[PDB]
């Protein structure tokens, strides 16, 4: 017989880990990293907070049980992610219009999302911006989902390129899903404004879209509050929406996966019925949540002394990005550069477009050990006072 | 705008999770819970293990780092699941032919399994024993494949109907899939003899069936090594298959969703090609698996003063399910059951089926606050000296 396996074809590269197997096959000393997709500290590592080694050790001494969780989770990580996402004394809260479901991670979260509408609505179509998160895509295809690409980035005054993004949403029907990053804007950095948030959720609510947001970021461009603004601009006028939100780079839990679907209907009755076909989803899946993730973020959250120390690491890594970017445009300058990096500045996240070509983004890798991905992304985070001036001349080198 | 949500219809009830909801709520306070596949010690506690604890001390005190594990886990895991399954010189081993992907538990290996086949495949239906764990149809259904069902389970007689197995099975076309358990059949506890499982493996290879194995509780039957006889013997016979298995259970490790999925090709480049996009149909449902589970099942494999440790509490855990099995039978026969209850020593794990009606399984629960599954399973492992007694007693009470 033939084999089953015979005539597969073989997947293409990722291309935010197709660089990193490039970069550790590098044997050249002094080689940097700003391809990669996670925070590194003043010295280039990515730590354990002490929030989570606390609250660690707290789980070690008093874990009696390794029993399996619920299908959607530790109760108090839901509520605990609902006042995150919507304010403590949101009306979607009292009135029980939310439901939150443990997930692993916020691709997990979204994965979820995406079952959960293709088997149980007439869901066909999400949109999602150009660019964007390149797993967004294949989350949404996994499902049968059509995915369609909305403008977002002006390349040429590194803005939001706001007139073309409402004309290039004209052809979304009512009933389709439209992605929205709820802050830090993966890769570009680029924002929208509270009245341009405003602007978006009034309009989604006459076009009659279902809205998605993508919230991996919270408290790395502002703050916890207010990365949240335009979230509940979206919350306080629709009856319904999706948040995928994700505990991997704001508490570093990267590895243990720790996310959050949560589902928001018109009223109790609805979500409650919409949540049980979601569990379902879940439980044909993954069946239920890894536990010691989300207990880490469940016990410092609830626990106002953690939640104290943790939110002065979240400052940490917020403001250290905010001075490599400073110091990037800065250095930039100090080295030659004649192209005006500013825009840098303006932008939220680890993420920005260098606005290098694929060509000068592959002279940097063979050239200088410089990797970056090839749309030009570069992760602000894995840049140090040791590494910024290399870093820096080999740019210069090859504008 | 009419609501997307707003004409979904609620999921009805899981089998065995929505069974586990009543009892937590049931106030009676001799309840008894036979339902959910969770090991109880002598205490009725579902304990972590002391070698497990052990490993979470050394984790704690040596991580460094949260950062993403690759798609397919953590190598060592990998390494040490394949010596399990196949054994330390097998030759799949040593001719590379196999690649393990760590997964959030069983389920999660199963349903990473179905998506790389639904989406890179030709497969449109899996054979799936009658009865099964009621999950794996959802499982299978929801990546897209058909599901049917093979006869096994003679319930005049109370044991394996190889001759009905056999025939059910022929109308399987090459290039279906056909699911097996390792050992300890769930819900009937009833495995094939060697001489069974050999007969299997040399029917698969003519027909041309591509095995699945769902392999959940290895070491609960007669031992690691044993328990992995039937399988061993596929993989000295076949060119591909497929194994999803669990550390759920013979380590106690639950809510930490501790699994692999094993593809087993003909070679090593198909291999390897095929599990590329195997670690495709990954990235796009949770993108990487959960670290804490198999970081610990990892360390107490690789140590072998750890590894000494569990192996003896899993030896213990076995032999008090025999043990319980022999009370259980004793035990109904001293409170007046009179019916012969002999086969439940014959069979093997934690699931037996009681040959209870589901209107006595109904009456036990309302009526004595007995929770078994409708079909008649009942947890062995759920059984203590102490709730053995009230529970005889209300079995003999509804026969
Ligand atoms: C036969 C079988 N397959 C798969 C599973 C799922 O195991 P896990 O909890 O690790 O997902 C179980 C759990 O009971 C099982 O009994
Ligand atoms: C990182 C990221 C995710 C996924 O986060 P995980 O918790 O690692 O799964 C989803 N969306 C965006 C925009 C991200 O940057």
Redesign the pocket.
């Known amino acids: 017989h033939v084999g089953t396996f015979e005539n597969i074809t073989a997947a293409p590269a990722d291309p935010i880990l197709g660089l990193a197997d490039l970069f550790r096959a590098d044997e050249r000393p002094g080689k940097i990293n700003l391809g990669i997709?996670v925070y590194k500290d003043e010295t280039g590592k990515t730590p354990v907070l002490t929030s989570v080694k606390k609250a660690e050790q707290y789980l070690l001494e008093n874990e009696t049980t390794k029993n399996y969780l619920g299908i959607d989770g530790i109760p108090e990580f839901g509520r605990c992610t609902q006042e995150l996402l919507f304010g403590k004394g949101s009306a979607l809260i009292n009135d029980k219009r939310a439901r939150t479901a443990q997930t692993?991670?916020?691709?997990?979260?979204?994965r979820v999302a995406a079952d959960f509408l293709a088997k149980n609505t007439s869901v066909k179509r999400v949109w999602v911006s150009n660019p964007?998160?390149p797993?967004?895509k294949s989350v949404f295809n996994s499902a049968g989902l059509e995915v369609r690409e909305y403008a977002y980035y002006d390349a040429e005054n590194h803005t939001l390129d706001f007139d073309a993004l409402i004309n290039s949403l004209n052809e979304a029907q009512a009933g389709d899903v439209v992605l929205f990053?709820g802050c830090?804007?993966?890769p570009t950095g680029i924002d929208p404004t509270l009245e341009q948030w405003q602007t978006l959720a009034q309009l989604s609510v006459e076009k009659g879209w279902l809205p998605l947001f993508?919230?991996?970021?919270q408290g790395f461009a502002r703050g916890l509050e207010e990365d949240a603004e335009g979230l509940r601009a979206f919350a306080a006028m629709h009856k319904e929406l999706i948040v995928?939100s994700?505990?991997?780079?704001n508490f570093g839990?990267?590895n243990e996966?720790?996310?959050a679907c949560t589902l928001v209907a018109a009223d109790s009755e609805t979500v409650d019925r919409a949540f049980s076909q979601m569990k379902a989803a879940i439980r044909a899946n993954y069946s239920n949540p890894p536990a010691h993730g989300a207990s880490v973020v469940a016990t410092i959250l609830s626990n106002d002394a953690l939640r104290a120390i943790w939110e002065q690491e979240l400052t940490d890594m917020r403001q250290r990005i905010q001075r490599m970017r400073q110091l990037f445009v800065n250095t930039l300058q100090e080295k030659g550069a004649n192209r005006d990096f500013s825009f840098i500045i303006k932008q939220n996240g680890m993420?920005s477009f260098s606005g290098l070509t694929k060509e000068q983004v592959l002279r940097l890798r063979e050239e200088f050990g410089v990797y970056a991905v090839a749309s030009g992304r570069v992760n602000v985070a894995g840049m140090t006072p040791d590494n910024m001036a290399p870093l820096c001349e080999a740019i210069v080198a090859v504008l």
Do not use: E, I, Q
């Open positions: 997709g692993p991670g916020g691709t997990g979260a979204l964007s998160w797993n967004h990053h830090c804007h993966n993508d919230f991996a970021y995928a994700s505990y991997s780079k839990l990267y996966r720790v996310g993420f």
